[PDB]
Design a protein around this ligand. Structure first.
Ligand code: UDP
Ligand code: UDP
Lengths: 414, 416
């Protein structure tokens, strides 16, 4: 029964943190769990309590005004919106620009480590395609662990439907060329399961997730927001609506610097009859004249500690914020762009009546003020958020899915 | 069913690390887990992935220990009726309460009670000398249980104490633990109960065969190594070529054995003359006071014992649970030169009697004993065989995962 389990993620702390509860659930059941990424992530892994395995070298994706253009927009992965050439082009661009940059810097070293350590199971972040390659080379079972509304597997479904419509001579697959190429050098074939896993462990509540033909194991999202301590000032319950605003390095590197500044956001919120807590990086802190009387500025505060009894979370649609607000039943305001699943994170809540999404480009002082007022005053938002909270709470925990993962590993692995 | 669970530990990283797998098992089942200690431990807690709650102020225990560890009154290694008059066992409780338990706990107990009042945990899980924990629990009606890294000399010495107490006339009955903890509880309007001394139940990481039998509700749990923040270095891939021998000296080793006995530099030189591969984990001051490094020896600041000990032949250490337990789950024979401090001697003796390892008093350690002991643990296969039986015993114990529902049921039974 006792397994070696290799977690693999691209070098994003935000992605890593989504994997920590499941990793610990498996370790707590007696399995050995190692987490592999590029050296830049080693320090972050080590502060999760989990054993880090540095692999390969660091990449230049972070250096490479905003990241929204039609070819990077996977927010509406629908047949009706994709000709063959459109979906093919999306796979070509995503493979060349994102997936290869994230993964090629470490894939061979990951295959090597897998050969040495011989994991029974590899659990991979959904864009960490180095993971299933390494698994397949050593015959390990492997599964995606999702932080995402599954635009990746859904766009792939669209892609395969269009591929099947093409004459044989015009059939082309950038994912098969890339991953099949690497697998070929180790004497292995490509299979579609290297793209979507042998199964999918999904932290997204079923009602908000795109329906797909996958072996799907739902698991409850449990907040992990990185290294955290409870400050003294949390004891003071607020006395009026508490509104939390997070801008990270994700926010800035992707939204750019072209839209409404955080300084204007603070000033708007500073005029309102609310308590404001703003988690800001040191550059956006300095670039800021006066701090309003109703506002506290922090470098970091643990969202899981802060969001109980909060009224609103304002953020860009990353899963840590989205999920932590969701489990606390806090309405969310998501001014964002069509990058990764961020727009879907916003629209899913918008359609459910649990929060508000707006395009970052349309954000003004008036929209900010009115949106916050609406999420505080209109009780239908809290009620819809509370239904989603309850849906998450009905989902089996990491603990509960451990035996399922054990059985699936026995079935699919060597 | 969803619980708030407060872990409480004295500010020792070695103690904290023993609690991490159970804490994560409970978090993985959907419960909220916070870990409280003095501010000095905050950084250590944060690197476990668990949420830290700094409480109270730091204490001076380490300064008072170094400025003054093994004497008859601090020796709880043989907690037996036959070796304790009333006056002997009373004196042991008086000194341990005044010197160790109060120093560790009084600096944070009131702030811990305050936090418990605010947060309202359903359950408090406490390190076995962190008596602030059960006080805070009792004040808010939380269920509470000890989580043991120790051969349970604490509860066994208490049993001896209570047997002798019962033999005294009622006017001569005196209990330093009841005075101390009952005093604090009294200020919050609560009574003392014996369950604040041994918990409502005991979650025990020591294999049953090596643990002292007691009148406790006992929940055995498998020890899973956690050795602090860790990564796998490249040089581990190289399987060894000859017996690998690992030596740890920590700041526990130094502060408690500190400077009467065979120096670490002499230990390195002895091992340096043998046909072995040596890895020595040493603090930065031990490293400086060292002329040459032998050819067969690698010196590290830190290396994860869970990664290092598979295939290793011997671990040499002072009897701390992290080392003991991690060697045990890897079936690695142990050589334990140590003193009668905490349960360290029992950690050594337990393995010695089982034929799985060797213990010697630190004061008797020479180059010849070191060399001969290592040779014996490498060459005589009966050591590996006995170690392997203990490994198998641990492996038959239910995991943290498996005991989660037991802890849930016990909390429902005993709590609010
Ligand atoms: O003050 C803060 C800032 C961030 N976070 C969490 O830390 C992680 C980082 O997420 P994000 O997507 O913002 O990316 P980052 O730029 O922090 O890498 C997520 O769990 C956030 O919700 C938090 O708990 N408190
Ligand atoms: O190189 C090292 C040094 C220590 N440890 C572990 O770190 C923890 C703390 O060490 P110890 O019990 O020696 O006491 P300390 O010296 O840290 O007080 C235990 O799990 C040890 O077994 C380890 O894995 N590798």
């Amino acid at each position: 029964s006792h397994m070696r389990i290799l977690f693999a993620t691209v070098s994003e702390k935000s992605h890593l943190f989504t994997m920590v509860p499941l990793a610990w659930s498996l370790a707590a059941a007696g399995h050995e769990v190692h987490v592999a990424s590029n050296p830049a992530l080693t320090a972050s892994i080590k502060s999760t309590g989990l054993t880090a395995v540095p692999v390969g070298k660091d990449h230049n994706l972070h250096e490479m005004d905003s990241l929204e253009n039609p070819l990077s927009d996977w927010s509406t992965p629908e047949l009706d919106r994709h000709s063959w050439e459109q979906v093919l082009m999306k796979f070509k661009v995503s493979v060349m620009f994102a997936y290869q940059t994230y993964n090629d810097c470490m894939v061979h070293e990951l295959v090597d480590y897998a050969r040495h350590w011989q994991p029974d199971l590899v659990i991979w972040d959904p864009v960490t395609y180095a993971g299933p390659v390494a698994a397949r080379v050593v015959g390990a079972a492997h599964a995606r662990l999702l932080w995402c509304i599954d635009i990746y597997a859904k766009m792939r479904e669209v892609f395969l439907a269009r591929l099947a419509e093409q004459p044989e001579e015009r059939r082309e697959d950038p994912m098969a060329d890339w991953l099949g190429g690497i697998l070929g050098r180790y004497g292995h074939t490509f299979d579609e399961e290297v793209v979507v896993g042998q199964w999918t462990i999904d932290q997204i509540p079923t009602s908000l997730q795109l329906p797909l033909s996958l072996r799907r194991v739902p698991v409850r999202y449990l907040p992990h927001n990185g290294p955290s301590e409870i400050p003294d000032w949390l004891r003071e319950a607020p006395g009026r609506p508490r509104v939390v605003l997070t801008s990270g390095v994700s926010a800035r590197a992707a939204l750019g610097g072209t839209f409404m500044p955080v300084a204007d956001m603070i000033n708007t919120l500073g005029s309102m009859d609310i308590d404001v807590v703003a988690a800001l990086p040191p550059e956006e802190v300095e670039a800021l004249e006066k701090v309003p009387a109703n506002t506290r500025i922090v470098d970091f505060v643990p969202l899981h500690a802060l969001l109980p009894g909060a009224s609103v979370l304002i953020h860009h649609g990353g899963f840590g914020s989205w999920g932590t607000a969701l489990v606390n039943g806090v309405p969310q305001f998501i001014p964002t762009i069509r990058y990764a699943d961020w727009w879907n994170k916003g629209t899913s809540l918008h359609e459910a009546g649990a929060g508000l999404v707006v395009h970052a480009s349309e954000l003004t002082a008036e929209v900010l003020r009115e949106s916050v007022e609406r999420l505080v005053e209109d009780a239908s938002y809290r009620e819809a958020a509370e239904r989603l909270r309850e849906e998450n709470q009905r989902t089996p925990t990491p603990h509960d899915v451990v035996p399922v993962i054990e059985e699936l590993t026995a079935e699919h692995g060597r």
